[PDB]
């Protein structure tokens, strides 16, 4: 729904994209990527801002649906900071790890999403009482959407560590706030 966090959020990236659009993908990545050089070490925006970058207009539809559907749903039954601190720990770890498997150069929601994904599953289940659940239909084809990232389906060239690190952040994160809650 219409939470804060949610929209800004979707405003971020949609400006980002037109960003991309005028100037290009290559301009943007060179400023928003995921330091490619020790030496841009300190320009901080970068752990985040990756996430912030979609390639085409399927990929950001896509992961804003989910973040709107996911996102929303978290914003509203936690509240504001829980859905801030969920993204940026799963931005900057998603990242971290796709850096890892595949270099600096990725952008996307996805990471994320699957963390949102991972947490809302793992939340409703254990903790029911939250308000917020993933569908059996959903959990499902998020575990399509993996494996088919693996077996680089159809011409794909899917950020994989971020799937995985994100899903992982998130079932965390739900484990943690599921033995307090």
């Known amino acids: 729904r219409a939470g804060p966090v949610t929209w800004v ?3 971020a990236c ?5 960003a991309m659009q005028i100037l290009g993908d290559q301009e943007v990545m060179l400023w928003l990527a995921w330091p490619f050089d020790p030496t841009l070490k300190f320009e901080f925006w970068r752990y985040f801002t990756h996430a912030l970058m979609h390639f085409s207009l399927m990929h950001i539809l ?6 709107w559907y996911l996102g929303g749903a978290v914003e509203k039954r936690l509240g504001s900071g829980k859905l801030i601190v969920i993204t940026l720990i799963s931005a900057l ?3 971290y790890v796709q850096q890892k498997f595949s270099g600096p150069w990725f952008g996307g929601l996805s990471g994320v999403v699957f963390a949102l994904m991972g947490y809302v599953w793992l939340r409703g289940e254990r ?9 059996r239909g959903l959990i499902i084809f998020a575990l399509i959407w993996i494996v088919a990232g693996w077996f680089d389906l159809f011409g794909m060239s899917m950020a994989n560590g971020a799937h995985i690190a994100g899903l992982a952040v998130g079932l965390a994160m ?4 599921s033995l307090n809650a």
């Open 127 to 135: 903790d029911p009482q939250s308000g917020i659940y993933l569908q």
């Open 93 to 95: 770890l998603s990242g």
């Open 174 to 177: 739900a484990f943690v706030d």
């Open 9 to 11: 959020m979707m405003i």
């Open 14 to 18: 949609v400006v980002v994209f037109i």
């Open 62 to 67: 896509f992961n804003l649906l989910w973040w």
